[PDB]
Write a protein that binds this ligand. Structure first.
Ligand SMILES: NC(=O)c1ccc[n+]([C@@H]2O[C@H](COP(=O)([O-])OP(=O)(O)OC[C@H]3O[C@@H](n4cnc5c(N)ncnc54)[C@H](O)[C@@H]3O)[C@@H](O)[C@H]2O)c1
Ligand SMILES: NC(=O)c1ccc[n+]([C@@H]2O[C@H](COP(=O)([O-])OP(=O)(O)OC[C@H]3O[C@@H](n4cnc5c(N)ncnc54)[C@H](O)[C@@H]3O)[C@@H](O)[C@H]2O)c1
Ligand SMILES: Cc1cn([C@H]2C[C@H](O)[C@@H](COP(=O)(O)OP(=O)(O)O[C@H]3OC[C@@H](O)[C@H](O)[C@H]3O)O2)c(=O)[nH]c1=O
Ligand SMILES: Cc1cn([C@H]2C[C@H](O)[C@@H](COP(=O)(O)OP(=O)(O)O[C@H]3OC[C@@H](O)[C@H](O)[C@H]3O)O2)c(=O)[nH]c1=O
Lengths: 346, 346
């Protein structure tokens, strides 16, 4: 509550809109200006209920220095969610990832330097690369280096994750070189309401609702560490308000599951047979396992995740997509068509 | 194994030295230098060797149409083009973002399109900083007390951060798209044709011009000096014999602090040991760099030839002394530029 006039970039997207709702509901002294370009992923509907005196949407690009300058002159912090976020899009056309994830971040950093304001960079666990599966690790996942920590080497695999990693590197250098008041969070895979239907969980749920088979990349052995977006929001809030300047905090809820298990759970909850899905073309350079040790955040800032029951969180998510079909139905055909250009049943 | 290579940035210091190396030692290779001729690019670095082996094309690595035209006729790209100076990056990061990141991206997309070999020339600065040997339990020779291929990226400046960012996308393009890329990270180069903004040549040519040498702070910082001729053979060995996707570190076990280097220059040039100015220290100044080149040595059999720094420095001093017309026109402008942000400490 030290910050009264914040900019949230990318706040019309999935995680960003959840954070804006978090702020609106829990920190009534904060005015939020969302800067969002409304790409395919941005959706004014994710904000509409709360737009008004407390929350303004400004449609524009984080790489538009003149616009960013105008907004930053009136702000006391920037929370940066704006990104091209999808690995599969980045493999088809990296160009917007370069522009938004790196050039965009640069532009916002230079504004933060100019006005000497607080900057929180929202990043991802994918910057660290991949890990082996637990069955293949001498400590079964519990040993040193078998999860990501704030000391783990960057080793990104894709155009998406390398542009994210690159953005993280310039944030840190802007701290050291210019004294920018920045922190960074690297979070594991989010799920919950308002996630774009291109992403794994909502794609399967909405495919089922639309009468299309879910799609599993390869055999589905890949492992993601799932956190509910609501816990991501409180994590970012903790770091924004209490984080040590220049530090990286990892956010995760100890929720590792393989894709096959998540899909099978979705099928069971939606009353579908356990074989009612297609294996499809695997992703180029697909990252195997991601896993976060969130000890630093928990121990230093007192944060704890509330949604640690994945089965319950997934039920609520399923219900959300089922109750909000008008939010996604018009995008379904185009998203499945785009996937068909590069994915076949195997 | 390559007959038609593009050397980006080959009108600059290290790049031109490489071009000379290829001209001399591999006269069957055709080199096309692609260089924008920034303040740091100098036709005089190549003029005497232009002909059937070496051609200069003036242009920007971020000019995709030009890059396309050249890459269509090439079998390898060796990528030196960069904004190279930490001090410049602190005053204006903008060209670093453009050249170092967007330029590397543009070249990687051309390498990917034409399926040609790509060697990315990078720097030890991507790893950040190390303590001085006196503050280390192994006095520089223990685990983690020098950089290795396993060291975390942690760059300090807009320069080193954009170089690190470029290394990350190279590696992701290998994993995601199968680009035939290698990376090298080299310690500080010295030798003929280095621009007089850089440490060693600045001091030598100040003394020649009757201007005091300039030492940042008290000169505690440590750089690991390698003659550019050894960098050239390192790059050649990686280009022709390296394993796709690998990173190799290049260094010659040449750590010295800046005060010692300056004192050696003063002594060799017949100046008093105290005939210099302490000047404003660099923001975020990296303390010590140090490279463990064991991988390159072990795997590719590379050995540096110029390991007597005293002799290499003497020859470098003599080169600047014998080629005053090569630098004299830049002296006043470079010193005036420094005067904008640097003053004598008193
Ligand atoms: N989804 C996850 O699991 C996850 C894991 C942790 C963090 N990440 C990071 O969280 C952030 C948000 O991810 P998400 O899942 O909400 O993404 P999303 O794809 O749902 O939203 C991206 C948002 O950014 C906006 N945007 C894109 N380019 C822009 C530009 N140039 N200028 C202004 N706005 C632009 C889009 O319009 C959209 O509203 C990203 O930085 C992502 O890298 C995501
Ligand atoms: N100098 C060193 O100690 C050292 C150590 C290892 C590696 N590095 C790396 O080696 C490379 C060359 O360094 P250097 O010391 O020779 O630099 P330099 O400053 O002497 O030369 C840079 C060259 O790049 C050219 N250039 C700049 N922007 C360009 C663009 N957009 N398109 C085309 N050409 C452009 C310039 O005209 C110039 O000729 C860089 O990638 C640097 O990061 C340098
Ligand atoms: C869309 C889709 C995905 N998958 C797999 C690929 C992954 O292993 C897993 C998750 O895929 P995505 O939803 O594409 O997420 P991921 O690549 O893990 O990245 C996500 O988490 C990290 C975030 O940084 C990123 O923005 C976000 O999209 O499911 C499938 O098996 N079937 C699918 O239809
Ligand atoms: C120009 C200058 C520098 N210094 C110090 C700062 C550094 O500790 C040291 C070397 O400075 P630079 O020549 O600026 O080199 P450095 O910053 O170490 O970076 C060089 O090596 C790594 C390369 O990546 C980079 O391109 C190249 O410029 O000398 C001085 O004390 N006096 C000076 O006048």
């Amino acid at each position: 509550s030290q910050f009264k006039n914040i900019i949230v970039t990318g706040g019309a997207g999935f995680i960003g809109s959840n954070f804006v709702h978090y702020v609106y509901n829990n920190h009534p002294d904060v005015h939020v200006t969302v800067l969002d370009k409304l790409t395919y992923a941005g959706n004014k509907a994710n904000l509409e209920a709360i737009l008004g005196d407390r929350v303004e949407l400004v449609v524009g690009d984080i790489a538009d220095a003149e616009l960013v300058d105008k907004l930053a002159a009136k702000a006391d912090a920037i929370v940066h969610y704006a990104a091209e976020s999808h690995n599969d899009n980045s493999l088809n056309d990296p160009s917007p990832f370069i522009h938004t994830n790196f050039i965009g971040t640069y532009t916002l950093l230079e504004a933060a330097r100019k006005y000497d304001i607080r900057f929180h960079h929202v990043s991802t666990d994918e910057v660290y690369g991949d890990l082996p599966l637990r069955e293949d690790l001498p400590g079964h996942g519990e040993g040193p280096g078998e999860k990501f920590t704030a000391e783990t080497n960057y080793n990104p695999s894709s155009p998406y994750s390398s542009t994210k990693a690159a953005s993280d590197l310039i944030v840190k250098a802007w701290v050291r070189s210019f004294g920018v008041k920045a922190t960074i969070s690297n979070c594991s895979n989010n799920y919950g309401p308002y996630q774009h239907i291109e992403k794994f969980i909502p794609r399967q749920i909405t495919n089922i609702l639309a009468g299309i088979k879910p799609k599993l990349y390869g055999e589905g052995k890949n492992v993601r560490d799932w956190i509910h977006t609501n816990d991501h929001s409180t994590g970012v809030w903790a770091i924004l308000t209490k984080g040590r300047m220049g530090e990286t905090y990892l956010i995760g809820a100890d929720g590792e599951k393989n894709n096959k298990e998540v899909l099978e759970l979705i099928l069971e909850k939606m009353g579908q047979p356990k074989d009612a899905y297609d294996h499809v073309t695997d992703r180029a350079g697909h990252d195997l396992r991601y896993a976060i040790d969130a000890s630093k955040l928990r121990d230093e800032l007192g944060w704890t995740p509330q949604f640690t029951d994945f089965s319950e969180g997934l039920e609520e998510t399923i219900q959300w997509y089922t109750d909000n079909q008008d939010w996604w139905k018009a995008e379904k055909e185009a998203v499945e068509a785009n996937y068909a250009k590069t994915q076949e049943v195997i």
